[PDB]
Paper text:
The UbiD family of reversible (de)carboxylases depends on the recently discovered prenylated-FMN ([name]) cofactor for activity. Here, we show that the [name] virulence attenuation factor [name]/[name] is a pyrrole-2-carboxylic acid decarboxylase. We here report that the UbiD-like [name] virulence attenuation factor [name]/[name] is a close homologue of Bacillus megaterium PYR2910 pyrrole-2-carboxylate (P2C) decarboxylase and show that [name] is capable of [name]-dependent decarboxylation of P2C as well as carboxylation of pyrrole. Substrate screening reveals [name] and selected active site variants can accept a modest range of heteroaromatic compounds, including thiophene-2-carboxylic acid. Together with computational studies, our data suggests [name] covalent catalysis occurs via electrophilic aromatic substitution and links [name] activity with the inhibitory effects of pyrrole-2-carboxylic acid on [name] quorum sensing.
Crystals obtained in the presence of 100 mM imidazole (acting as the buffering agent) did occasionally yield nontwinned crystals which were used for data collection and refinement. A structure was obtained to 1.65 Å resolution using the apo-[name] structure as a molecular replacement model. The asymmetric unit (AU) contains two PA0254UbiX dimers, with each monomer found to bind a [name] cofactor via Mn2+ and K+ coordination. The overall conformation and position of the [name] binding domain is highly similar in the four monomers present in the AU and resembles the closed conformation previously observed for the A. niger Fdc1. In each of the four monomers, additional electron density was observed located above the [name] cofactor. The density was modeled as an imidazole derived from the crystal mother liquor. In two of the PA0254UbiX monomers, the imidazole density was continuous with the [name] density, suggesting a covalent bond between the imidazole C2 and the C1′ of the prenyl-derived [name] ring. The electron density in the other two monomers was noncontinuous between the imidazole and [name] and thus modeled as a noncovalent, stacking interaction between imidazole and the [name] aromatic plane. In both the covalent and the noncovalent ligand complexes, the imidazole N1 is within the hydrogen-bonding distance of the N318 amide side chain. Hydrophobic interactions with Y279, W322, F432, and M434 largely occlude the imidazole from the solvent, with the exception of the water molecule hydrogen bonding to the imidazole N3.
Author numbering:
A (entry chain D): 1 to 496
B (entry chain M): 1 to 494
The structure:
Amino acid sequence: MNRSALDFRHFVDHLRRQGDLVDVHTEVDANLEIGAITRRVYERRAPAPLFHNIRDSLPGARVLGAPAGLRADRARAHSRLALHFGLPEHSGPRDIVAMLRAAMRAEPIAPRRLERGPVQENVWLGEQVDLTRFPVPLLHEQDGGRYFGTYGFHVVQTPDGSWDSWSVGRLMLVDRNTLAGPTIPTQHIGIIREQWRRLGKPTPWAMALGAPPAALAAAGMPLPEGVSEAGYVGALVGEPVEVVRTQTNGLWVPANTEIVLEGEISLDETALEGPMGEYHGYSFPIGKPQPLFHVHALSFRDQPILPICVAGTPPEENHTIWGTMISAQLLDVAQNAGLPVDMVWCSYEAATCWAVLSIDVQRLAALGTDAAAFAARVAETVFGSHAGHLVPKLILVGNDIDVTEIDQVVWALATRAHPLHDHFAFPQIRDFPMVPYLDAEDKARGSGGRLVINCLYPEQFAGQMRAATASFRHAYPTALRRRVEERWSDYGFGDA
Amino acid sequence: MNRSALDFRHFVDHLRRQGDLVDVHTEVDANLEIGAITRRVYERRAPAPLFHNIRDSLPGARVLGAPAGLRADRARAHSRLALHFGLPEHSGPRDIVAMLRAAMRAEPIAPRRLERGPVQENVWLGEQVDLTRFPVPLLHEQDGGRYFGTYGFHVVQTPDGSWDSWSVGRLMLVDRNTLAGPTIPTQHIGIIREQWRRLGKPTPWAMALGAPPAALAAAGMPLPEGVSEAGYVGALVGEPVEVVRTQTNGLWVPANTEIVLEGEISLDETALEGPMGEYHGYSFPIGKPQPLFHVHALSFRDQPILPICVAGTPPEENHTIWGTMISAQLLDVAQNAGLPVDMVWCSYEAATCWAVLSIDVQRLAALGTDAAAFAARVAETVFGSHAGHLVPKLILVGNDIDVTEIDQVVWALATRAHPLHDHFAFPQIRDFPMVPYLDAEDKARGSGGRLVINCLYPEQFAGQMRAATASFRHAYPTALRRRVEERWSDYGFG
Ligand SMILES: Cc1cc2c3c(c1C)C(C)(C)CC=[N+]3c1c([nH]c(=O)[nH]c1=O)N2C[C@H](O)[C@H](O)[C@H](O)COP(=O)(O)O
Ligand SMILES: [K+]
Ligand SMILES: [K+]
Ligand SMILES: [Mn+2]
Ligand SMILES: [Mn+2]
C-alpha cells in the first residue's frame, strides 16, 4: 500500500490485489472504444480496466483507464483515490484532506537524484520519436484530436532554477513529434512559460505519464505559487521522490515513470487544439489555438502503461483528483486566513463547479457579522487564492451537516437558503474561463460567474439556531441512541 | 400485489414475503424507542419494522414503522412505496407518476357500501374510549406530546353530501378521548371545516389508521378541490374501495381499516399542539393552539396494527408519499396548462422543499420566450394550484437530465444556473406557512419564500444547446455503446 504512492506500476499491481482492477485481454480500439469502456467504468463505479491489447499500437504497450475512479462499494468508494497516497481502502474525503494538510506543514523532502531508472529502458531520440506508435486515444466522439496526455504532468523549472513545477494539463497529439495544449496564464505552467518568454526563449519541458501516484495527485493540486510540488510529495510520503535527468534538457523527472516526453514549449507556434470532453461534463464544439509542445526525445519502461482520464460527467479524476486537491488547499487557505471553516469539499456531483464550506458555528458569533459581510469576506479570501480562483460557486453552511454528503448539502440548500437574502453574486471578481455557464458578456468582461450561496440562518450569526434536527442523531438522547445501536441486530435487523 | 393496495394487513404480509419486513419480538418502549428505531430505519433504508411487544399497551396491538420508507437495494429502492399502488418491486418514480396520472383521466369508481367489515371486530363507545391504551408513541425527544395519528387520514364530508374528503394530517393525543391537530385553511380539511362553521356547527369526522395503502396515498395527494379521494382510489386500482358507516356520525370509512376514530372537530375549543419533528427536517421549539378532535367512539380489527411516520430528515413518508403525490399532481397541472413539462419531481433529498420540472426542449423554441418570462409563467401556474402552493422552490431544467436523480439535478444546478440571470424570487406570491427558512417579515406579509431557479441555458429558448454532454450515453455512437454493453463480460467485468 505504501510503495503504491511512489511507483505507478506497483500501484496497478496493488489495485489488482484489492480486487479493484480488471485485466482486459481482448483487443480494443484506441479509436473511441477505450474511452467508451472507461466512461462506463466511471459511471458504474466499476474496477479500473488495464488494457493489454490495443489495436495498431507498439507491441506490449498498455493503457490504464479510470486511475482514480470511484468504487460501487460505498464503504470502499474512495479507495483508488486513497491509494494514490498509500492510504487504506476505507479512507474517505476527510482522511485524505487531513493527510494533505499535514504534508503542507511538514518540511519538504527534496527529490533524490539517481543515475539510472526503469523509465530509461527504452529511449527514442530525434527522428526515432513517433508518438503515433503509442495507443493514443480518441477519447470522445466529438473531440478535435487524440490525446496523448490526460493523466500526466508537465515538468518545467524557473530560468533561475529556484522553482520546480509539476502540473497536470492536457496534451493533444498533433503529429509524430508534436503535441499541443493549453497553458492558462494563471496556472503555474503559464506563469513559468511567461518567465522564459521574457528572456526570448521557449520553455524547456517534459511530461511524466504513469508517474508516482502521489506526484500525479500533487501535480493536480493548486499549491501556492513558488512551492515545488516534488518537495511537497516527499513531505507527504515521508521520503524522497527518486528522479533522473532527461536525455536532452536537464530536467529531473521521476525515475520509475512509465513514459517521459521531453522537448520544449514553443514561443509562438500554435495548432488548433481541442475540443475535448471536459471536467464540467460537456463537449463544446470548437477548439482554439494552443502552443506547440515539441517532443525532441522520449523514454519509456518496457510494456509501458499509458494512464488516461476520459473526462466528463462525474465522478472522474477532474473530480476525484482535482476537486479533492482543491478542497484540501482551500481549507488551508480558509483556516490560515482566520475564517471559521472546519472543512471544504468540492462535491464530485457538482463537477468541480462549487465548493462547500463547513462553518464552525461555535466561532461565528464572535465575528459580530452577518450573511452579506461574511459572504464578501469569504469571496475575497477564497476567490483571491490560487486554488479558489478555480471554483466559481461557494456554498456556506453550518458544520452540523456533513459537507462531503451531497444529500445533506441538498437539504441545507433547500431548507436554509432564503431566496431574497442568501444569493450573493460577485460580478466584479474575475472568472476561471472554463466555467460552462459563462455567456459572451461574461467572456468579454472577464467576470460575471462568481457566487456565494449562504445557508447560515440569520440567528447563527448570534450563536443560535431556530430549530433542532429531526434525525436519529439529533432527536433522541445519547443513552437511547446507544441502546438502539447496541440492540440493532438483536431487534432483527442484523446488517440492515 | 393488487390486494396489498386495498388491504393494509395484506400489505404487511406481502412486505414480509418480499423480505422487506422485520418482526420485532423484543420488548420496546413507545416512549421514544420505537421512534428512534424507525428513524434509523429510514436513514439506513432498512426493512420496515413490525413491533409486536410494546410496554404498557393493549394486548395484541402492534405498530408498523416506515410504512413507505426506502430500501438500500437501489434496484428495489421504491418497492414499499410502489406496493401502496399494487406496483411491483422495481417500479420507480416515473412508473408511479404515470399510474397516478392515468387514474386522473379514468372515470371515478365510487366506494362499495358494505354492512359489516373487520374494522368492527372491536367497538368502544363513549366512556369505553381510552386512546391511551394503544401504543401511542412519543416520536421525537422534544415533541410536545405523543402522536396517535401520523399515518392515517381524516374523513369528512360537505354539509351538502357532494364531496367526501380523505386527507392525511397529524393528530396529537390530549387525553383518553381527545386529540388535537392542525387544519390549515388552504387544506381540504380546513375548507370543509369552514363550511360547517358557516352553519354554526362542528364537523363530523373520522380518522382511518392502517387504511388501505392506496387510500392512504390518495389521502396524501393534493387532488383538486371537490374531487372525492375515494373515487380516485377506485379508479386507480380498478375497483371499489369497500366502506362501512361509522357507529355514531354517518361517515363511510374503509371496511378493512385497522383502527377507526370518530367524533367531531370542535368549532372553538383548542389545546396546545406540537411541536413535532416535521417534514422539512427540523424540530421547531414551540407549539401552537389547535382544534380539539373529540373522539366519541372508535373501532378496530383484532390485533390492530398502528402505522406511524417518524417525520424529519429524508427520506420518510412526507417525502416518499407526500412528495411523490405532489409530483404527479404538478405534472398534470403543468401539462393541462400547456407548459412544455414532461416530468416533475420533488427530490426526496430536498425534504419536499423544491420541485424539479423537466422541460421538453423540443417544445421550448415555439414559445418565443426567455428565462425571466418563462419562470414567471411557471411560477403563476404552479404556485396557484393546490399542489404547487405546497412547495416554495422550483427548478427548471431541460429534459436531457433525469430529474428524479439528485446527482443529475446537482450537475445542472452547478453548471447551468447563472448567478446573475437565473435566480427568480417571487416575493408577492403567498407562501405555505411551514417553510422553514421564512423570517418575521415574511410571516407578517404572508409572502417572501418563493423562488424559481432557472437552469435552461439561454440558447435553449431558440432550440439550441451550447455543448453536448460528455458521458457514456452522449459521447459515443449508438453502435459503439451496444458493442461495449455486449462485450462487457468478454472484457473481464463479470
Ligand atoms: C487532475 C487533472 C487536472 C487538470 C486536468 C486534467 C486532470 C485529469 C485533465 C488533463 C483530464 C483535463 C484538464 N487538465 C487540466 C488542468 N489544468 C489546466 O490548466 N489545463 C488542463 O488541461 N487540470 C488542473 C491542474 O492540474 C490543477 O489546477 C493544478 O493545480 C495545476 O498545477 P499548478 O497549480 O501548479 O499550476
Ligand atoms: K500542481
Ligand atoms: K388528499
Ligand atoms: Mn504549482
Ligand atoms: Mn382533497
